Amino acid sequence: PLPTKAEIQECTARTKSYIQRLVNAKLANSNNRASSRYVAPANLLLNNSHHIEVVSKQMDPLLPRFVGKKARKVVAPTENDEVVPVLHMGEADPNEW
């Protein structure tokens, strides 16, 4: 069966929102006071006993924002959980080939 209709109006919705989150996440990153025009306590820690409140700090505009971002190279591991079986279905041939 082809995937109905009201099924795609879902995947399109959630995917669209997610991509917007990535894009807007990026446009606020880089160096342009220009590029920003195209754009909650939330923490129950442990048992929530002490709660939390999270608040951002405004950076001194001159000083570097993202004090820790520094270009460096990394080799990533490949964590192999499971094996994908590779399942397929000469003699005189070499004299040809």
Partner 1 sequence: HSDMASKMYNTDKKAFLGALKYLPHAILKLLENMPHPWEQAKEVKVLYHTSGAITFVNETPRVIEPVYTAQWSATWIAMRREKRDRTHFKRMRFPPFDDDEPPLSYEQHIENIEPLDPINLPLDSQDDEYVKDWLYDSRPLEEDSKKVNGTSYKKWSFDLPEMSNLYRLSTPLRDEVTDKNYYYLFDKKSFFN
Partner 2 sequence: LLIHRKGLTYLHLDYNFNLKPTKTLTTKERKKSRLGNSFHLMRELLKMMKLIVDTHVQFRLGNVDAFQLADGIHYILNHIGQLTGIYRYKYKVMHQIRACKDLKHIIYYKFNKNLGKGPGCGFWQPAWRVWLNFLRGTIPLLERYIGNLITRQFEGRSNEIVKTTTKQRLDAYYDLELRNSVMDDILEMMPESIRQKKARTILQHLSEAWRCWKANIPWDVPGMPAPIKKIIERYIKSKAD
Partner 3 sequence: DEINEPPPNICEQCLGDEANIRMTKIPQGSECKICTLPFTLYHFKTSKRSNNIIKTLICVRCATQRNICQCCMLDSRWHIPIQLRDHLISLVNEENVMTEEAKNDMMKRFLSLKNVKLGGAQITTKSFFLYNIDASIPEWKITDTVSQLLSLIVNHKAKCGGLRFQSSELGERFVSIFIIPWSSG
The binder of partner 1 chosen from 9, 55, 60, 82 (CB under 8 A) = 60
Residue 25 has φ and ψ, to the nearest 5°, of -60, -35
Whole-angstrom distance, CA of residue 17 vs CA of residue 68 = 29
**Binding site partner of 33, from RNA, partner 1, partner 3, none, Cβ cut-off 5-8 A by kind:** none
75 binds RNA (CB under 7 A): yes
51 binds RNA (CB under 7 A): no
Nearest to residue 3, comparing CAs of 12, 16, 20, 17?
12
54 binds RNA (CB under 7 A): no
